[PDB]
Design a protein around this ligand. Structure first.
Ligand SMILES: O=C(NC[C@@H]1CCCO1)NC1CCCC1
Ligand SMILES: O=C(NC[C@H]1CCCO1)NC1CCCC1
Ligand SMILES: [Mg+2]
Lengths: 151, 148
């Protein structure tokens, strides 16, 4: 495998381990992965980190009642670019009415970028992904990892 | 460069103040001229920009990153949850535990400056040159960082 491919696999493993940990504990999370549409405008609304990814940092970021836990984490490749970022809120009628701001923000950014956003519900622990204006809910650990590997 | 150093000092002091008030244990070593790569390598790599918010989030109790030392280098957070050597000095106050002994320990073999927040009292101390300077005010800590 090339170094880029191995680095990508490490990042996926870090993300999936963090998301799985948060889902089990009902830790709300909002994690947007930049793709080909640049997200600089939104990255600049948060606290800059420019940090190497780890499952441990991702978890620490979203612990409730902490400085960094509200708003989105935005990733660029293997790095956490910024935390506590603003994303636009979708007005889509296909967002389940019981869902809160994190899900509406994820769908919102997915309507104006090709990014992939992962959401952990603080109510249920359910894991969802927003992509291209669609929200896919109640993902298994395997489905999430397969979505990341495919993207 | 001067504006960047002051920004980092302000970020550190704001984080330390927050933790001291809440009696959140913390251990933050600032590399100086003695390289500490061997200890940085024992932690979780971050190479992150300093912010008060990131420092606070690192040290929250019962989280992956809160046990061990944060090591700063070249104005960034190099790693978290790092190992530091424990001092065997018999002249550390006996009521103090592992965090303070680790800060003194790294200070015995490097020129680094380490900041400790006690989880028992929220007291703020600094280890340098093998000595621990205890019960620091906000102003005293700022003076040490500026002097360093
Ligand atoms: O693009 C990289 N990782 C991408 C991750 C995979 C899962 C979400 O984003 N790493 C390359 C840039 C730095 C070295 C290779
Ligand atoms: O921010 C600091 N140095 C900045 C360097 C890199 C860019 C320009 O010079 N040092 C801080 C750490 C401890 C207290 C001050
Ligand atoms: Mg379904």
């Amino acid at each position: 495998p090339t170094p880029v491919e191995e680095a990508q696999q490490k990042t996926i493993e870090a993300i999936t381990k963090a998301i799985n940990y948060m889902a089990k504990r009902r830790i709300g999370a909002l994690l947007t992965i930049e793709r080909d549409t640049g997200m600089g405008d939104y990255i600049e609304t948060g606290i800059p980190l420019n940090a190497k990814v780890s499952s441990e940092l991702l978890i620490n970021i979203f612990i409730p009642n902490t400085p960094l836990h509200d708003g989105a984490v935005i990733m660029k490749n293997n790095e956490i670019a910024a935390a506590a970022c603003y994303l636009p809120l979708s007005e889509s009628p296909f967002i389940s009415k019981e869902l809160g701001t994190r899900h509406r923000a994820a769908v919102g950014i997915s309507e104006v970028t090709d990014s992939l956003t992962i959401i952990v519900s603080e109510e249920t622990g359910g894991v969802s992904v927003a992509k291209n204006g669609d929200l896919h809910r109640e993902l298994t650990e395997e489905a999430l990892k397969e979505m990341l590997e495919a993207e």
